[PDB]
């Protein structure tokens, strides 16, 4: 499905 | 063996805690998540939200990624996160990390996986 593959940032 | 989706889960999901408990949190977690195996991963974020809530970010606010790609999403709400960062007194294999607990909006890149 459409899922997170990378953590880009915070805030 | 490792899908992009399972890899994100291993590196950033920690739903068993509401927040970092002590300064030693990053040291234990970086390690048990196998992030200090070959080398010392320099920076890593842990999110203390349920998997479902983190997956739900992909249906939230569409924003540009730092690379220009437009498959990034920003959570509507702030989330409990823990920043793990190698200290200047860290050396493979004695990985040392500074734990920084915070409540911020997370930005993730999503793939129809």
UniProtKB/Swiss-Prot annotation, chain A:
Coiled coil: none annotated. It comes from the Eukaryota. It is found in: Secreted. The active site is at residue 6. Pancreas. Interacts with and forms tight 1:1 complexes with RNH1. Dimerization of two such complexes may occur. Interaction with RNH1 inhibits this protein. Monomer. Belongs to the pancreatic ribonuclease family. Endonuclease that catalyzes the cleavage of RNA on the 3' side of pyrimidine nucleotides. Acts on single-stranded and double-stranded RNA. This is Ribonuclease pancreatic. It comes from Bos taurus (Bovine). The gene is RNASE1.
């Amino acid at each position: 499905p459409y899922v997170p593959v990378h953590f880009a940032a915070s805030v | 063996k490792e899908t992009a989706a399972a890899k994100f889960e291993r590196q950033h999901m920690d739903s068993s805690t509401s927040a970092a408990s002590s300064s030693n949190y990053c040291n234990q977690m970086m390690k048990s998540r196998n992030l200090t195996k070959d080398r010392c991963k320099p920076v890593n974020t842990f999110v203390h939200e349920s998997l479902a809530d983190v997956q739900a970010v992909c249906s939230q606010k569409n924003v540009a990624c730092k690379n220009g790609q437009t498959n990034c999403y920003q959570s509507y709400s702030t989330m409990s996160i823990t920043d793990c960062r190698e200290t200047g007194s860290s050396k493979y294999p004695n990985c040392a990390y500074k734990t920084t607990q915070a409540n911020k909006h997370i930005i993730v890149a999503c793939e129809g996986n």
